[PDB]
């Protein structure tokens, strides 16, 4: 579950 | 004092009796000199880049 | 592309241009000081203490090169040539303290000149150095002559110290701007020694504050 | 159905971070606009201080651009509704181009301002003859142009994708990196290395040399009193404290942001647990708070110490009110 | 009894005003109203040439229109090559304080003066080639605002003690002395036939002299503040006046009065320099707010606006070829326009 906001 | 005022009156008196042209004739003369030399002016008439030195 | 002569001309121009840069970086190190007075303010005395137009004085004190311009000989309209001096390091302004008794009134004329060179638009940032000249004769003139002649209200205590401090506070009250420029006041005799030392300390302070105001750190 | 894509945090922390962002927005926009007007008003003997006032104008403009270009969009769809990405197709990569160009602009402006302070204090006589207003305008437009052209990889790497489990969905649309993980890793490494390590090294070295030299001048003036003596040493001590404040504020403001981007790009998908997911999004709010502090703390440094700059500023606010 | 003489002076001034009003049948703009305008004069800079380290006060062209000289407060005046931006010479002045310079018609000599109130002559073309001081004209007791060469041997100056003076350089003494001003004179402009010239003062009055005769021929008034520049219209029968109160006026030598005024509401600053083009149709005026306008001299319409100086434009002038305009300013950058 990698976060996507960068 | 008195000599300075005499010199000022003499200068104004010499300046007063000078014949004067009418202003429309001087307007026509300024206009005529502008028209007679408008052709060879590099600033009014823009110059092609061969003849421009800069 | 350039011919045989044109390349040598460009070499000549580069040698001239490096002479310009060398002479300019030499001239940027030395300090230039405008000098003013009412004429009867002992400005010739401080010029002697530093030891037909502009009169220049070149003196060196403690590895710093000073150029002092005596502009009082140039008698013409001041408005036309005072903008030539925009960007001097400091102004040296002279007042004879003994002019409060003398009428030509001369003390108020000196304050009028000082207001005129403080609030000028060319000298917004240029700090001012005051030499209140003729200390001993003013100290003697207080005991015989009151200071109520010059100023209408003074609130008393006529001694040397209160009167001298009052004249200093008047002149330092004259500048409308105090945040960007600062007045350095020195009570000086005709024969005192440390006057050029005061100029040196004042100019060194002004150079440090000019560097900091350049960077934004002041 | 797309509930796995949702970020779940405490909503009162969202309200707090929203209020902090609104406060930083109004303070930073007020400070940088009135700083630009105050630097516009100064007109008396522009010779070499006009160089530094153009640098300060460039820095205040870059901070104002960070705030105005970044704050509404990132506030809305990175703090409240990150899920639908209501902005759209090319606005994703255009928005990352704008934010990263503004970040490079602020980084290179603070670096260039440290360079100019070094030239003015440590080599003072050469700064007049060498540097000119044309040279300064060339240098400022050059660092703005370099900040523009460095942000183009963030224009290529960012783009819209549809990370729903289904192919098409209204809430599925997100704004993420699109290129391969090694490539976006290279882009984020180059962005982090340049926009942090190059200004931090030049700011640390130059401001430490300047602070050392004018602490030597403090020791000299206290050694040898004068008329401006207690004014000069106070000016120089406040100069020292401004230099250390710029260095420490640069580190504290922009290190956690690049730590967030770097720990994004390093950590592979096998290592991400939902604890790291939630910690990342709280860390995201904290780092953008420390990021937007830096856009506000530049007019505060100028009004604190420069007495000339203080009065024109507070009179400008008195004219408006 | 001097009340009578002052009243006679006022009577003469009233009669002069009434006579020149009686000669004023029509204004200039009513005549030139039918003329087509000059268009928009867009001139881009060329050959930006640099190397002064202080404010440039004055510059003058060469008569070949090849070289020019410019003077600044760095203590040096530099002889430039405007075609290729080369520095032909760099002459160190004896005194840094300089506010005028002239270039000779022969090209052999240059002049220089300022707050040192000594108009110095430099010999350019000499064996053992370096620029040495040939003659050094002193005795003027007020700041020199303008020196101009008549020939290699005759130079005229206008300076800060309300007087002008012709010199004979080889003797070293002033031959003719021009008096009649209450305020000090800021400028000077020789005629094309060089028999006569005009000076302008800080008493808001420009006057005409004859060089051989020695006395003021006539006196031109019309505005309020001190004036800073004048230049002859190239016919010689007219000239323009650059005043401090944001106005340029055009004056007539034969019609004796003000002919027209070049004013605008957006400008309130002073006018430091004035020159004409070869046709005389374009008037060029550089201002205190670091831009130069291009005034249509028949219509008082500004046709173009030069820009690109940071500080006050102190000096300008047009080539005798008519090709180019060099504007110097206080930011030490001189710009050849075209």
What is the distance between the alpha carbons of residues D308 and C218, in angstroms, rounded to a whole number? Answer: 8
Mapped onto helix, strand or coil, the DSSP state of residue D1 is coil
Burial C145-166 (b: 16+ CB within 10 A, else e): ebbeebeeeeeeeeebeebbeb
Q: Is B32 on the interface with E (CB under 8 A)?
A: no
Q: What is the 3-state secondary structure (H, E, C) of chain E?
A: CHHHHHHHHHHHHHHHHHHHHHCCCCCHHHHHHHCCCCCCCCCCEEEEEECCCCCEEEEEECCCCCEEEEEECCCEEEEEECCCCEEEEEEECCCCCEEEEEECCCCCEEEEEECCCCEEEEECCCCCCCCEEEEEECCCCCCEEEEEECCCCEEEEEECCCCEEEEECCCCCEEEEECCCCCCEEEEEECCCCCEEEEEECCCCEEEEECCCCCEEEEECCCCCCEEEEEECCCCCEEEEEECCCCEEEEECCCCCEEEEECCCCCCCCEEEEEECCCCCEEEEEECCCCEEEEECCCCCEEEEECCCCCCEEEEEECCCCCCEEEEECCCEEEEEC
Give the strand order in the sheet containing E258-262.
Answer: E227-232, E238-243, E248-252, E258-262
From D132, which residue of chain E is nearest by alpha-carbon distance? Answer: E331
- On whether the CB atoms of residues E287 and E267 are closer than 8 A, the answer is yes
Instruction: Answer whether D touches B (≥3 Cβ pairs < 8 Å).
Output: no
Q: Tokens standing for E121?
A: 């002559």
Q: Do E115 and C9 touch (CB under 8 A)?
A: no
Q: Does E86 touch chain C (CB under 8 A)?
A: yes
Task: Give SS3 for D161.
Answer: strand
Say how far apart CA E73 and CA E53 lie, in whole Å: 8
CATH number at residue E95: 2.130.10.10
Q: Is C32 helix (H, G, I), strand (E, B) or coil?
A: strand
Tokens of E237: 């029968």
D134 contacts in E (CB within 8 Å)? 333
For residue D162, give both structure tokens: 């549809």
Which tokens hold the place of D98? 């704008």
User: Which residues in chain D touch residue A4, judged by CB atoms under 8 angstroms apart?
Assistant: 5, 163, 174, 176
E29, closest residue in chain B (CA to CA)? B27
Task: Residue E21: give the domain boundaries.
Answer: 1-338
Neighbours of chain C (3+ CB pairs under 8 A): D, E
D264 vs A1: CB contact, 8 Å cut-off? Answer: no
Is E308 in CB contact (< 8 Å) with chain C? no
> Which residue's entry shows tokens 């710029």?
D246
At C90 the three-state DSSP class reads: strand
Residue B53 structural domain: 1-54
Pick from E254, E222, E229: which is nearest to E243 by CA? E229
Question: How far apart are the CA of A1 and the nearest CA of chain D, in angstroms?
Answer: 5
Instruction: Please name which of E335, E233, E65 lies closest in space to residue B42, comparing C-alpha atoms.
Output: E65
To the question of whether residue C196 is assigned a binding role by annotation, the answer is no
Q: Do E275 and E316 meet the contact criterion of CB atoms below 8 Å apart?
A: yes
Separation of CA E71 from chain center: 15
Positive or negative, the CA dihedral C11, C17, C18, C20 is positive
Say if CB E220 and CB E263 are below 8 A apart. no
The answer to whether D20 touches D289, Cβ cutoff 8 Å, is yes
**DSSP states of chain B:** -HHHHHHHHHHHHHHHS-----HHHHHHHHHHHHHHSSTT-TTTSPPPTTT---
| Cβ within 8 Å, pair C25-D126 | yes
Supply the DSSP string of C122-144, one letter for each residue.
S-SS-EEEEEEE-HHHHHHHHHH
User: Is C101 annotated for ligand binding?
Assistant: no
Domain tally for chain C? 1
Helix (H) or strand (E) holding D202: helix D198-223
Query: What's the token pair of residue D144?
Result: 């703005």
Q: Where are the beta strands (DSSP E) in C21-137?
A: 31-36, 55-60, 65-70, 90-96, 127-133
**Is C105 annotated as contributing to ligand binding?**
no
Q: What is the CATH number of the domain that holds B38?
A: 4.10.260.10
- Integer angstrom CA distances of residue E267 from D4, E96, E262, E263, E292: 67, 32, 11, 8, 11
How far apart CA C14 and CA B45 sit, in angstroms, is 36
- How close E172 comes to chain C (CA, Å)? 17
Provide, as residue numbers in chain A, all residues whose Cβ is less than 8 Å from the Cβ of D264. Answer: 3, 6
Q: Which helix (H) or strand (E) holds D177?
A: strand D173-177
Residues forming a β-bridge with E264: none
Tokens of E269: 């600053």
CA distance C123 to C90: 10
Question: C84, C87, C121: which to substitute to probe chain E, counting the most E Cβ within 10 Å?
Answer: C84
Q: Would you say C44 is a known binding-site residue?
A: yes
B3 — contact with chain E (CB < 8 Å)? no
Residue E175 to residues D132, E153, E155, E324: CA-CA distances in angstroms? Answer: 46, 12, 10, 35
Give the span between the Cα atoms of C89 and C82, in whole angstroms.
Answer: 14
Write out residues 96-155 of E within 8 Å (CB-CB) of B: none
Mutate to test the interface with E, among B14, B20, B25, B50 (most CBs of E within 10 A): B20
CATH code (residue C125): 3.40.50.300
From the CA of A5, how many Å to the nearest CA of chain D?
Answer: 6
Q: Which of residues 81-110 of C touch E (CB under 8 A)?
A: 81, 84
Question: Which domain range does residue C111 map to?
Answer: 2-218
Residues 6+ positions from D11 with CB-CB distance below 8 Å: none
Does residue D129 belong to the interface with chain E, where contact is any CB pair within 8 Å? Answer: yes
Residue C175 gets which letter from DSSP? -
Give all domains of chain D, ordered by start, each with its CATH number.
1-321 (1.20.1070.10)
Residue D278 backbone class (left: φ over 0; alpha: ψ -120 to 50; beta: rest): alpha
* Cα angle: E288, vertex E291, E295; to 5 degrees: 105
Q: Do C81 and E143 touch (CB under 8 A)?
A: yes
What part of E 55-74 touches C (C-beta under 8 Å)?
73-74
Q: Any idea what DSSP says for residue C69?
A: E
The verdict on whether residue C115 carries a ligand-binding annotation is no
Q: Which residue of A has its CA nearest to D81?
A: A5
Confirm whether residue C185 is marked as ligand binding: no
Count CA atoms within 13 Å of residue B47 on its CB side. Answer: 19
On whether the CB atoms of residues E263 and E218 are closer than 8 A, the answer is: no
Walk across the sheet containing E144-149 and list its strands.
E144-149, E154-159, E164-168, E174-178
Q: How many CB pairs under 8 A join C and D?
A: 88
- Tell me the backbone φ, ψ of residue E79, rounded to 5 degrees: -95, 115
Q: Do D141 and D109 meet the contact criterion of CB atoms below 8 Å apart?
A: no
**Annotated binding-site residue? C190:** yes
User: What is d(CA C217, CA C215) in angstroms, rounded to the nearest whole number?
Assistant: 6
Closest CA to E163 of E153, E174, E152, E172: E174
Q: Are E70 and E53 in contact (CB under 8 A)?
A: no
Any chain E CB within 8 A of the CB of B12?
Answer: yes
Rounded-to-integer distance, Cα E120 and Cα E132, Å? 10
Which experiment gave this structure? cryo-EM
Q: Establish whether C37 is an annotated binding residue.
A: no
Of C182, C186, C211, the CB nearest to D121: C211
Residue of D nearest to C23 (CA): D129
CB-CB contact of D26 with C192 (8 Å): no
The answer to whether E161 contacts chain C (CB < 8 Å) is: yes
Cα separation, D39 vs D50, whole angstroms: 9
Q: Extract the tokens encoding E41.
A: 């004069």
Q: Record the tokens describing residue B34, joined without a space.
A: 């502008």
Is C41 labeled as ligand-binding?
Answer: yes
Whether residue D280 contacts residue D9, with contact meaning beta carbons closer than 8 Å, is answered with no
First to last CA, chain A: 15
What are the Cα distances from residue C100, in Å, to C81, C128, C213, D307?
A: 30, 22, 38, 36
Q: Which residues pair with residue E144 across a beta bridge? A: E159
CA pair distance D222, D232, nearest whole angstrom? 10
Neighbour-count burial of E143, counting CB atoms closer than 10 A to its CB (0-12 exposed, 13-18 middle, 19+ buried): buried
* Contact with chain C for residue E87, Cβ under 8 A: yes
Q: How far apart are CA C79 and CA E244, in angstroms?
A: 12
DSSP C42: S
Subunit contact C214:D52, Cβ cutoff 8 A = yes
C40 is in an annotated binding site: yes
CA angle, C124 then C128 then C131, to 5°: 160
Q: Tell the residue number behind the tokens 């180059």, with chain if given.
A: D190
Contacts of D78 in chain A (CB under 8 A): 5
Beta bridge partners of E337: E45, E325
Cβ-based neighbour number of residue E260 at 10 Å:
22
Reduce the DSSP state of residue D284 to 3 states and report it.
helix
C203 belongs to an annotated ligand binding site: no
Length of chain B, in residues: 54
Helix axes C195-215, D91-121, angle to 10 degrees: 170
Cβ separation E53–D46 shorter than 8 A: no
CB E160 within 8 A of CB E144: yes
CA distance C199 to C188: 12
Query: For testing the chain D interface, which of C92, C172, C204, C217 should be mutated: the one with the most D CBs within 10 Å?
Result: C217
CB pair distance less than 8 Å for D133 and E310: yes
Question: What six digits make up the tokens of D75?
Answer: 């506030």
Element (H, E) at D160: strand D158-162
D132 phi and psi angles, rounded to 5 deg: -130, 170
Distance (Å, rounded) from C-alpha D137 to C-alpha E148?
A: 38
Q: Is C45 a known ligand-binding residue?
A: yes
Q: At what angle do helices D91-121 and D198-223 cross, to 10 degrees?
A: 30
User: Angle, to 10 degrees, between the axis of helix C135-144 and the axis of helix C160-174?
Assistant: 110
3-state SS assignment for residue D151 = coil
Tell me the three-class secondary structure of C176-214, residue by residue: CCCCCCCEEEEECCCCCCCHHHHHHHHHHHHHHHHHHHH
Phi, psi of C149 (to 5 degrees): -65, -45
Taking the alpha carbons at both ends of chain E, their separation in whole angstroms is 61
- Look at chain B and report how many structural domains it folds into: 1
Number of domains in chain E: 1
Chain E residue with Cα closest to C56 = E95
Q: Is E203 on the interface with C (CB under 8 A)?
A: no
Subunits close to B (at least 3 CB pairs below 8 A):
E
Instruction: Report the C-alpha gap between D185 and C29 in whole angstroms.
Output: 52
Sign of CA dihedral E86, E91, E92, E98: negative
Coil, strand, or helix at residue C75? Answer: coil
């Amino acid at each position: 579950k990698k976060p996507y906001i960068l | 004092s008195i000599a300075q005022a005499r010199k000022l009156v003499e200068q104004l008196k010499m300046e007063a009796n000078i014949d004067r042209i009418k202003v429309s004739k001087a307007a026509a003369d300024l206009m005529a000199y502008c028209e007679a030399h408008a052709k060879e002016d590099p600033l009014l008439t823009p110059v092609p880049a061969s003849e421009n030195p800069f | 592309t350039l011919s045989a002569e044109d390349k040598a001309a460009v070499e000549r121009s580069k040698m001239i241009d490096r002479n310009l840069r060398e002479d300019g970086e030499k001239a940027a190190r030395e300090v230039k000081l405008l000098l003013l007075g009412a004429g009867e303010s002992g400005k010739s005395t401080i010029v002697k203490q530093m030891k037909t137009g502009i009169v220049e004085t070149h003196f060196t004190f403690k590895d710093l090169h000073f150029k002092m311009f005596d502009v009082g000989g140039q008698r013409s309209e001041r408005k036309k040539w005072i903008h030539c001096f925009e960007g001097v390091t400091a102004i040296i302004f002279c007042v004879a303290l003994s002019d409060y008794d003398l009428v030509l009134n001369r003390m108020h004329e000196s304050m009028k000149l000082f207001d005129s060179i403080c609030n000028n638009k060319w000298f917004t940032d240029t700090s001012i150095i005051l030499f209140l000249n003729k200390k001993d004769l003013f100290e003697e003139k207080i005991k015989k002559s009151p200071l109520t002649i010059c100023y209408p209200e003074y609130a008393g205590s006529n001694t040397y110290e209160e009167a001298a401090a009052y004249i200093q506070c008047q002149f330092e009250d004259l500048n409308k701007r105090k945040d960007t420029k600062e007045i350095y006041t020195h009570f000086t005799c005709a024969t005192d020694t440390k006057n050029v030392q005061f100029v040196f300390d004042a100019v060194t302070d002004v150079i440090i504050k000019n560097n900091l105001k350049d960077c934004g750190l002041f | 159905p797309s509930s796995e894509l949702d970020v779940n945090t405490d909503i009162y922390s969202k309200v707090l971070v929203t209020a902090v962002y609104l406060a930083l927005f109004v303070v930073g926009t007020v400070g940088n606009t009135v700083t630009l007007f105050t630097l516009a008003r100064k007109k008396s003997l522009q010779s070499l201080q006009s160089t530094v006032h153009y640098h300060l104008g460039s820095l205040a403009l870059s901070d104002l651009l960070t705030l105005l270009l970044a704050m509404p969009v990132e506030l809305y769809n990175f703090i409240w509704v990150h899920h639908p990405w209501a902005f759209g197709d090319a606005g994703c990569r255009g928005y990352y181009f704008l934010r990263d160009a503004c970040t490079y602009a602020t980084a290179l402006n603070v670096a260039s301002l440290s360079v100019e302070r070094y030239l003015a204090i440590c080599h003072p006589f050469k700064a007049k003859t060498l540097m000119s207003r044309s040279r300064t305008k060339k240098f400022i437009s050059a660092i703005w142009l370099a900040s523009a052209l460095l942000a183009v990889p963030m224009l290529f790497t960012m783009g819209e994708q549809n990370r729903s489990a289904d192919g098409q969905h209204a809430g599925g649309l997100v704004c993420t990196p699109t290129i391969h993980t090694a490539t976006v890793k290279v882009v984020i490494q180059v962005n982090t290395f340049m926009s942090f390590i190059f200004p931090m090294v030049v700011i640390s070295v130059l401001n430490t040399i300047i602070a050392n030299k004018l602490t030597v001048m403090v020791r000299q003036a206290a050694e040898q009193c004068t008329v401006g003596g207690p004014g000069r040493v106070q000016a120089l001590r406040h100069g020292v404290r401004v230099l250390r404040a710029v260095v420490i504020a640069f580190v504290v403001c922009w290190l956690p942001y690049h730590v967030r981007r770097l720990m994004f790009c390093y950590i592979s998908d096998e290592q991400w647990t939902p604890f790291l997911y939630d910690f990342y999004h709280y860390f995201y709010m904290v780092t953008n708070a420390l990021f937007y502090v830096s856009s506000t703390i530049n007019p505060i440094l100028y009004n604190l110490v420069s007495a000339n700059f203080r009065h024109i500023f507070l009179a400008t606010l008195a004219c408006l009110c | 009894e001097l009340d009578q003489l002052r009243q006679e002076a006022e009577q003469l001034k009233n009669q002069i005003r009434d006579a020149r009003k009686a000669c004023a049948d029509a204004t200039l703009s009513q005549i030139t109203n039918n003329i087509d305008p000059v268009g928009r004069i867009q001139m881009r800079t060329r050959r930006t040439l640099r190397g002064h380290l202080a404010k440039i006060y004055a510059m003058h062209w060469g008569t070949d229109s090849r070289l020019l000289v410019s003077a600044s407060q760095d203590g040096k005046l530099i002889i430039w090559d405007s075609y290729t931006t080369n520095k032909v010479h760099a002459i160190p002045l004896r005194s840094s304080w300089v506010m005028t310079c002239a270039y000779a018609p022969s090209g052999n000599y240059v002049a220089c003066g300022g707050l040192d109130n000594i108009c110095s002559i430099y010999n350019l073309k000499t064996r053992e080639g370096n620029v040495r001081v040939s003659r050094e004209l002193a005795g003027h007791t007020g700041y020199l605002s303008c020196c101009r060469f008549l020939d290699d041997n005759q130079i005229v100056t206008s300076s800060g003690d309300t007087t002008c003076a012709l010199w004979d350089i080889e003797t070293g003494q002033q031959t003719t002395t021009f008096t009649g001003h209450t305020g000090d004179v800021m400028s000077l402009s020789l005629a094309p036939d060089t028999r006569l010239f005009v000076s302008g003062a800080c008493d808001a009055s420009a006057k005409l002299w004859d060089v051989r005769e020695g006395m003021c021929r006539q006196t031109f008034t019309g505005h309020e503040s001190d004036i800073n520049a004048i230049c002859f219209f190239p016919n010689g029968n007219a000239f323009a006046t650059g005043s401090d109160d944001a106005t340029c006026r055009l004056f007539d030598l034969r019609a004796d009065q003000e002919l027209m005024t070049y004013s605008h509401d957006n400008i309130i600053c002073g006018i430091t320099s004035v020159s004409f083009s070869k046709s005389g149709r374009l008037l060029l005026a550089g201002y205190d707010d670091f831009n130069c306008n291009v005034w249509d001299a028949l219509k008082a319409d500004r046709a173009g606006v030069l820009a690109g100086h940071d500080n006050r434009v102190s000096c300008l002038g047009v080539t005798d070829d008519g090709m180019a305009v060099a504007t110097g300013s206080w930011d030490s950058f001189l710009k050849i326009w075209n």
